[PDB]
Symmetry: C2
Subunit: 620 residues, 2 copies
């Protein structure tokens, strides 16, 4: 009965039927995106209306459409034709990936390039990559993918070990034309293999690891009701899944006594961008918007018990649409479990004689996705003490190139002749805040150093300052690790027992933001990534920091256009957008398969509670 329940196979089949009868899903149509819409603000009228948003592509060249459908009422609510030269192309379709390699295999220019390198075309894999917006006027309004080539010596070979540098092609995947083939010169194809399951490379496997058994004899401490509503250790929330964003957390609240207190209305990773820092023309266009261009949810892995998720695991299997509107289940796509997390609080008091120790635990909600050579884990954590944390885990195989004779300022050497271009992995977390309700404000908190003198005669004092962000035009903020800068989201109308506004403090990792020149195409398309924190006034249609249609979109849709409205954010319904990322200079240890590296952020209560919220945790 909950409006936040996961989409069912029956709902998706009904959407397909509604579209087909409306004449909107003929044989030339493909669904590029399908997802449920969240309820509107103030939906307390109980009038449930399950609506779905659909992007419909046309493989014959006709204009795509954006369609909203009510499964409740069985009707098309709206259907708008899109001018993609203006508002952006639709996300990349899975079926367009294979088109690139197939089209190149019959192109005379491509074959000539492969012949010069003595490469069998049957052995050449082509990575189909998003195109961006650069200098090529003929690409305006067309669906372009760019392709980079890798050699697979045999069917089980890791092609990433054998990049074919000096060669790139551009493909129109609708007209099925190879627009350009660029060959800047022959590089030797690196010859060493990168097969991390080959005994020749691994050596004999270790026999020294003894098992660790994690069990829950009485089952887990959380409950799952209505398919996706979670209650755990005073936390209450709904776990959503969207094919673009992946796992989305709704209605995060904490049961404090007999009050259910809201904290975050919606939490998601609303964009992620991977920009490459190699100036070679073979790769200087390379930027992945994994969320906005590829849709990370549709490539979620099925997670294996004992291997991907260890312990007493409760799975969700979200349902998505395929390109034809058929429901497709991602079996075991979401892992949920609780984990011991060490000491929570401890004190041995000499005067009282009381020795006290309590243990911490966290609830984990996670999924994993694979996009080409990259694999990303998305982890949300809830802790006993009210802390909320997000962690991204990056692994997979690094994207490779030739390593040039004479070295490079922009590429690392991984093996003889084998390089890995510098790049970043940057995320945007969209946090639709609801600290004790919707009237919230953000303050920036800096440490304040004080000079020795009157009132500070020994020169030991220090303090802090808080600045309220009152309008969107002043709510674009940068990190300052040296001054311990954090941001507090508070409710000025809800006070704790000391008559202070209740709040939560955002702790960032203070990693570098986007490094590209501010005048670059990627800086314009990923403007969100140039600053650590943005605050907007909530609006229904301001969902993504990059806009609705990211693929081949020139710039002018997302956060910079939202904040130009300069809306009041002082005690209002607000959304915090936090940018955070990894800057990756690949090391030898990242090859041939990369150990996990992590980045994230956390929110901790700041006078939200009247005292420690974990005094009622038992002694274990």
């Amino acid at each position: 009965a909950s409006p936040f329940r996961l989409a069912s196979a029956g709902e998706i089949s009904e959407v397909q039927g509604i579209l087909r009868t409306a004449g909107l899903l003929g044989p030339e149509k493909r669904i590029a995106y399908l997802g449920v819409l969240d309820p509107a603000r103030g939906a307390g009228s109980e009038a449930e209306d399950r609506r779905f948003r659909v992007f419909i592509h046309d493989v014959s060249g006709a204009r795509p459409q954006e369609v909203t459908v009510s499964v409740t009422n069985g009707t098309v609510i709206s259907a708008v034709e899109l001018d993609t030269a203006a508002t952006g192309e639709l996300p990349v379709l899975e079926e367009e990936f294979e088109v690139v390699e197939q089209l190149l295999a019959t192109d005379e220019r491509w074959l000539k390039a492969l012949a010069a390198r003595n490469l069998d075309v049957s052995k050449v894999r082509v990575a189909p990559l998003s195109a961006g917006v650069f200098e090529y006027a003929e690409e305006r309004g067309r669906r372009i993918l760019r392709g980079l080539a890798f050699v697979q010596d045999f069917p089980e070979d890791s092609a990433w070990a054998h990049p074919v540098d000096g060669l790139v092609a551009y493909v129109d995947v609708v007209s099925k034309e190879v627009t350009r083939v660029i060959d800047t010169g022959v590089f030797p194809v690196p010859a060493e293999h990168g097969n991390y399951t080959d005994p020749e490379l691994t050596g004999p496997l270790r026999t020294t690891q003894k098992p660790i058994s994690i069990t829950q004899p009485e089952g887990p401490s959380f409950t799952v009701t209505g398919g996706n509503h979670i209650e755990w250790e005073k936390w209450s929330l709904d776990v959503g899944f969207d094919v673009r964003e992946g796992v989305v957390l709704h209605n995060i609240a904490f049961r404090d006594g007999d009050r259910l207190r809201p904290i975050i209305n919606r939490a998601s990773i609303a964009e992620m961008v991977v920009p490459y820092g190699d100036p070679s023309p073979i790769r200087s266009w390379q930027n992945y918007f994994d969320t906005g261009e590829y849709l990370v949810g549709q490539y979620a892995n099925s997670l294996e018990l004992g291997c991907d998720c260890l312990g007493d695991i409760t799975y969700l299997s979200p349902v998505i649409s395929d390109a034809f509107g058929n429901p497709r289940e991602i079996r075991n796509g979401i892992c949920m479990h609780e984990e011991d997390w060490g000491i929570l609080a401890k004190h041995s008091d000499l005067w009282s004689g009381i020795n006290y120790t309590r243990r911490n635990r966290r609830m984990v909600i996670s999924f994993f996705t694979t996009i080409g050579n990259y694999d990303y884990g998305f982890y949300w954590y809830l802790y006993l003490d009210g802390t909320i944390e997000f962690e991204a885990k990056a692994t997979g195989v690094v994207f490779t190139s030739a390593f040039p004779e004479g070295g490079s300022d922009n590429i690392s050497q991984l093996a003889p002749g084998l390089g890995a271009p510098f790049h970043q992995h940057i995320f945007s977390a969209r946090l639709d805040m609801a600290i004790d309700g919707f009237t919230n404000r953000v303050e920036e908190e800096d440490v304040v150093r004080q000079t020795m003198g009157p009132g500070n005669e020994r020169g030991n004092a220090f303090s802090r300052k808080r600045t309220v962000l009152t309008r969107e035009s002043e709510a674009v903020r940068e990190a300052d690790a040296r001054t311990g800068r954090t941001w507090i989201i508070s409710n000025p109308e809800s006070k704790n027992r000391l008559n202070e506004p209740v709040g939560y403090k955002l702790h960032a990792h203070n990693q570098p933001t986007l490094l590209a020149d501010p005048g670059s195409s990627i800086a314009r398309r990923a403007a969100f990534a140039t600053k650590d924190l943005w605050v907007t006034r909530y609006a229904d249609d301001e969902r993504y920091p990059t806009g609705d249609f990211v693929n081949q979109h020139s710039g002018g849709a997302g956060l910079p256009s939202y904040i130009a409205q300069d809306r009041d954010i002082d005690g209002q319904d607000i959304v915090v957008w936090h940018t955070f990322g990894l800057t990756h200079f690949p090391r030898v240890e990242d090859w041939p398969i990369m150990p996990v590296d992590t980045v994230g952020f956390k929110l901790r209560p700041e006078g939200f509670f009247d005292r420690s919220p974990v005094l009622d945790v038992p002694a274990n």
Copy 2:
């Protein structure tokens, strides 16, 4: 047979006997510090010589002595009388703690202050705190403790909830004289209790937590030999314990094929300072050097199975000396165990069809200490992939004060009338490096942004720069989170298969350093804490960043005096000193007992290995 074995009870009893026969341990003597000396450099002569360093205090006022003893040969090697006005006082003795409260209970000025506040002297606990060096000329060369008062309403009451503000006393603990009693005015004593085991405060305990059982059916994967030598998943090390520093890690090495490769010769937390930022004269002198003044190892907790350390735990019980030279065992003072640590590496490859997942684990070595109201956990982690990490866990009860009418810029309100002064907790890690041997160097690595233009036509390139620190005078470095600054420790004479120097990269958390005015007493005494990174040339006697005798020492002994020698550090035997800390603005949630907060650092391999070192990990 190992020279790095833990001190035995028999060794300590022999030291006691050697001292007594030498006439150095009469009834007026107390041992303030006793510890084993590490072997000298180049001890490959196998000529073992177990030597102990002892600080001997005299309760009659005679000069203390520093004594070195050989238990091997049964002789006093040297014994020097100390001029404490020059070189500093000895660490605080446990038996001097109780002296403060007892002496104040009979002082007419103290009693008058308590009478004005209607406090029963039998209910007043006095926190005995280190004195520092300030304006009081009569303190030069005397052992002073300062006392702050708290009311205990009944024997099991938490006195921290009832600070007696406006009152401080100074005590000479040798002459047994109260030198000064300062009363700046009556503050109400906060009345609410802070008893976190009282059902009135906790409410009914939760019944919702289901057990998590962590077991190892075949036992742990590590082995312990020679009492303290650890082998685990290619790591090899020796776990030492010193009464001042606590757990010390020796001879950290990694078995790469058939080579045992050194990484760190000695790792320890060599100082920690807790400076308070309240300018009130009642507390503006307050700075704890927990390591150097109090000796954190002697207050190590006995750690309880299932509560402090969960899983298949292997304990060490280090032996220390009491004040009279008797051996004292700290039962179950060190926990060692391995922990699952999630996904290590994962890739699902479309082209090869191979799906690959491996799990990570870490080895944990930890101890907990309690100093008054504060409890600190020290955790060392070794990971499969070669990462080394340290984490400090801070909990216990926050130090309190009155909350002034009209508020404070330097104190947080925790409960009606109850305050908590701002403060920091800053650590110094001393890392005697040995990356593939002792010829090491440090480079500072910054991200480099590049401007759009020729050779970077699309404005996407970025790079990095490395600066070698060649002499001590240029090796005092600051963090720069915005430029992604890290430090690489490399061996210029040991190269990987790509002919690059092998190395390890230090990743700091980039938290604020010491906030006090540079002209303050604490900035002079804790100069190490004003900068993030120092590199020195190794020397036997340069053990602590604050010098050997920190208590009441004016300044002029530690890192600033070492680096003035301006020694060559480019490809030499070097020591890295990393400062890192928490800046604590107490929150309501920290009361009445504080949930753990953490800070730390880590080192990751940087071309140390020829490829990923975890390819031989099995599928689980």
